[PDB]
RNA sequence: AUUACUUUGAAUAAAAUAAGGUGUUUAAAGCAUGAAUAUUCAAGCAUGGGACAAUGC
RNA sequence: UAUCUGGUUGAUCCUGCCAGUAUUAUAUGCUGAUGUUAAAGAUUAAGCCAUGCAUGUGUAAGUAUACUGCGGACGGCUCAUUAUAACAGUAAUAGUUUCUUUGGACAAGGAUAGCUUUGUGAAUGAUAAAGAUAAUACUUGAGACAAUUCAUUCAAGUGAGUUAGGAUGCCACGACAAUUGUAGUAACCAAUGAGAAUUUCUGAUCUAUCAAUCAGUUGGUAGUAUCGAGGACUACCAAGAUUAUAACGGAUAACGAGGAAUUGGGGUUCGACAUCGGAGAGGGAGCUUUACAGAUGGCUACCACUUCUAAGGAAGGCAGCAGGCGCGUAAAUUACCCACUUUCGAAUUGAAGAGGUAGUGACGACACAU
């Protein structure tokens, strides 16, 4: 699959590396699971050494936080507003860390930046500016 | 200071936000400009969480054209056993230059130290620098 | 080497009509030269249908096959032909497998489908076919 | 180039000056595997084609019986010296004959 | 290398193969000791050189050399009871 | 290699295992346990080389499996159990006990242990870690995890452990007025008194130790195993006391 | 002020190189007390000296 | 043993090379009384293979009027690849980490085996469906935290840490077999682990009839991906990186190291092969099981081969041990046994062409008939 090894790159001087062996399984790699908006749907992928990763494709509820009053209540996310990694990620409404999202402050009153790894943790968390 | 797209924020941030500077280890001093400065760096040995391990080399800074990274040159020797004579050699190493050292220029002695892989070729941090002469090329970082 | 009575198949390959080579004998294209069993007529070019043994020269392939005259059998053709049970079918491209007079296929595999008319005619071909359309 | 720090010129000089010998250079050119009929082999098997007699050089006289042998690995033609007195009769046409160098090296 | 079990040689042929100053002296020892062939003469010659070098390497250092005292005392001791 | 290695070749085994070179192609691989791979002696070799109880290794299984050999406070049934440092070793079926100890000649020596002094075994503190729940505990040399220890203990001291009760008895600090026995390389098998320790902030800490007869030797901090405080010997030292004879009474003595 | 140089140590796979011991009947062998066994060229770590040396105020 | 000798001339003195010389490793002619030891399909073909064996396992402690568990990811063979790649010494993981081992409701719900019940094919370790039947196979159930994610705080040993730990708000998995003899399980911490994997410094043959090379290329930001750091990948930004101290490229009949042959000192040649590391199972490519495989005595597709056939189809990878053809100057028996060493297992017993013995054996080493 996708190998993260350094045998397909070049040297610091521009020279091309020459192959000696095939791909090694210790260089695993899995296709990104862009966490979009939608119903709760989280898969479980079996990683190396038997550990299980909560692989998330779509979630709508995320556990937020706001430190000025120390209250953490989950809420539904409306849509992604702005992303600092890529501009085409805004339209697809993907959920990635460090992406500005807009929410409904229904349980915060009675602009959120994601600070988790929803593709790996399986859940969405954030905070309020 | 704050000019790029993403919100450049320091890894260890605390409200009075305070400037987090940790004191360095093996007999080095923290630069004065690094305390009162408004700069930000996520790989600086002082203001971030990168540790300098046992390996430590030194050399002369060769290039200062790369953003927050410089190239050091080490003109060492190699002993040829058969001829009983040494042949001069060199090796170039890219070291991550923190923006704490603003007067660093090409041709300045620098003490480097190992750390975790920061990029494809950069695996070291600058620890101190010393001034030298000039050649009309006062090229800083 | 043929085993049976071929029906009527509308021949769509002429003289000097390049066909592919479904075989695995290191030959690419074989331009038809003649057709075995062709009852000719004045000013008429030899016609090859489906399941018709031909005589073709290899103009592209391995050196021991290039520039020589071989004997082939057409396994699929692009000219629409009608089966007797009212089916009107045609393939994607022409192709032909190198055989000998006894019918013993020279290769060992066939790429793509094989028309039914050219499978029962030569039992040595139907075995190697992936599918028989 | 005697200097203590000049260990690159001396090494480079010897690398350059070593290519001019007629003996070691034969051991690094790829000609033994290419132009030598024997190659790196001790013995060569072949087939007899022609019987030929080479007259000796100027001071000597007489005809040296020999055979033109075609190898089985390269196909080249080499003249072979029949060993003993009256031994040309023992060899025949189209038979396996072993060919193995001479006293002078190669 | 092919085998774990060690091996060694005992006799080395003299460089010059034919000398009349070495053929005569060989039968002055072969006939005297009643030896079978010339293998034995080469074997003792290896033995003498086996320790002659050992005495020569350690003779070049000072009398206070710890290795000279350690192996030298063993070298003289081994060669005295023999 | 695709994963873990199982077969240990004869030569790849550590040299202090007394093994030959023509005996066989393989050597018994010590399993995971309380001590390292090269810091150990497998239990199979102890009962066949040092003890000479069994003609071959087949009969070792007909011994350990019978619940015969007792090590530390428990009793094992593993043929190749890893036996390392001076942990006690009791065999009640033969009424005799030993102790795996180093010696100045770079080997593994067995000092007999009486029934009165086999009730406890020394252990070396490796690191002090503040566990979860504000529960500190110290990892010992044999990998033993112990509960709440004395708070005065450091990470490089020594603790006098008991087998049955499993509690700390006495503690000896790592200071300048104590004695230690080495487990290192050239210096292992040597006992002496620490006289000076130099700290290098770069890589290592180097300590100077003086023998009983005045001999001074240098070693690394990782090799130090404190045996007592104030030239007092808390366990039975080997037959040679652990002194380093200057090879004057080895070449000459062995003649007679 | 570094570096080189030089003296020391530490750690440094076995096999093997030269062997310490050991009458396989000698020897090739073998380790039946395990020589401190010395090994590490090139590099690297700490250290006593600065004559010769390279770096510029 | 710090060693020379014949050869240009009528003769002499030199440079100069040819041949002679001694030794290691290959082949071969002739001869070949023994005892001990011992190499042995690599050079040209990592070419192709008929056959036979080489991975299986049951204690009282899982299920008994085959299921389940572990292993085949070790061992063994070959040297095709490979030129700062690998490897060796060394340093880091304050940038990651398992398997095994050692220290911390007097009982629930089920159907799937064995054996059949009726068979279908010429076969493939071929496969159909009807009846039940147990769990240490699967869910539950409860008898009571731990550890991860996120936002915020108290802040120390440590060469060095807003760090081990503690306290908050909160999400998530959520336990200690409904466990067997007349030991077994879930997790969490640590050691085994100087281990495995990445990585720091130094070190490689010839070539300039190879002088300029690189565009994910050099670095930064932010994310993704992976057990884990990182252009490993992605979007944006700047133009940067190497280079006469030999960059980029080319050849090897190049796996590297420990080492071997030969040496007065200095050196030269070799090393696939005892042991360590690396790579591969006709060729790449893609994946399954699992703690570790890009596994090939596992699977699939393609290219090239091989075997049976009822002409409808089926599997196979001897660069494993013997043995067959070819290749060549060039290389052994289609043997027996787990007794020695060791490994695997449901564990004192069962298995091993690993291993040992026997057989051929003038590659070699030691004593030695006449």
Automatic annotation (TrEMBL), chain A:
Top-level taxon: Eukaryota
GO cellular component: cytosolic small ribosomal subunit
Stretches with biased composition (Basic residues): 6-27
GO MF annotations in UniProt: structural constituent of ribosome
Gene3D superfamilies recorded: 3.10.290.70
Any single GO BP term: translation
Keywords (A to Z) from UniProt: Ribonucleoprotein, Ribosomal protein
Record-linked InterPro entries: Ribosomal_eS8, Ribosomal_Se8/biogenesis_NSA2
A Pfam cross-reference name: Ribosomal_S8e
Annotated region (Disordered), positions in chain: 1-33
Stated family: Belongs to the eukaryotic ribosomal protein eS8 family.
Protein's UniProt name: 40S ribosomal protein S8
Organism whose genome encodes this protein: Entamoeba histolytica (strain ATCC 30459 / HM-1:IMSS / ABRM)
Native organism taxonomy: Eukaryota, Amoebozoa, Evosea, Archamoebae, Mastigamoebida
From TrEMBL, chain B:
CDD domains, A to Z: Ribosomal_uS17
InterPro entries documented for this protein: NA-bd_OB-fold, Ribosomal_uS17, Ribosomal_uS17_CS, Ribosomal_uS17_N
The keyword Ribonucleoprotein belongs to this UniProt entry's keyword annotation: yes
Keywords carried by this UniProt record: Ribonucleoprotein, Ribosomal protein
Keyword Aminoacyl-tRNA synthetase: no
Stored Pfam families: Ribosomal_S17, Ribosomal_S17_N
CC per GO annotation: cytosolic small ribosomal subunit
One annotated GO molecular function: structural constituent of ribosome
Coiled coil: none
Listed GO biological process terms: translation
Domain Small ribosomal subunit protein uS17 N-terminal: 2-57
Family: Belongs to the universal ribosomal protein uS17 family.
UniProt protein name: 40S ribosomal protein S11, putative
Lineage: Eukaryota, Amoebozoa, Evosea, Archamoebae, Mastigamoebida
UniProtKB/TrEMBL annotation, chain C:
Biological processes per GO annotation: translation
A cellular-component GO term for this protein: cytosolic large ribosomal subunit
SUPFAM superfamilies membership: Ribosomal protein L14
Matching PROSITE patterns: RIBOSOMAL_L14 (PS00049)
Pfam families: Ribosomal_L14
Entry-linked Gene3D superfamilies: Ribosomal protein L14 (2.40.150.20)
Keywords: Ribonucleoprotein, Ribosomal protein
HAMAP family: Ribosomal_uL14 (MF_01367)
Organism of origin: Entamoeba histolytica (strain ATCC 30459 / HM-1:IMSS / ABRM)
Record protein name field: 60S ribosomal protein L23, putative
Keyword Ribonucleoprotein in annotation: yes
Family statement: Belongs to the universal ribosomal protein uL14 family.
Any one Gene Ontology molecular-function term assigned to this protein's record: large ribosomal subunit rRNA binding
From TrEMBL, chain D:
One GO term (biological process): translation
Cellular compartments per GO CC: cytosolic small ribosomal subunit; ribosome
Keyword Membrane: no
Keyword vocabulary terms for this entry: Ribonucleoprotein, Ribosomal protein
Taxonomic superkingdom: Eukaryota
GO molecular function: structural constituent of ribosome
Family: Belongs to the universal ribosomal protein uS12 family.
Protein name, UniProt field: 40S ribosomal protein S23, putative
Complete-protein stretch covered: 2 to 107 of 141
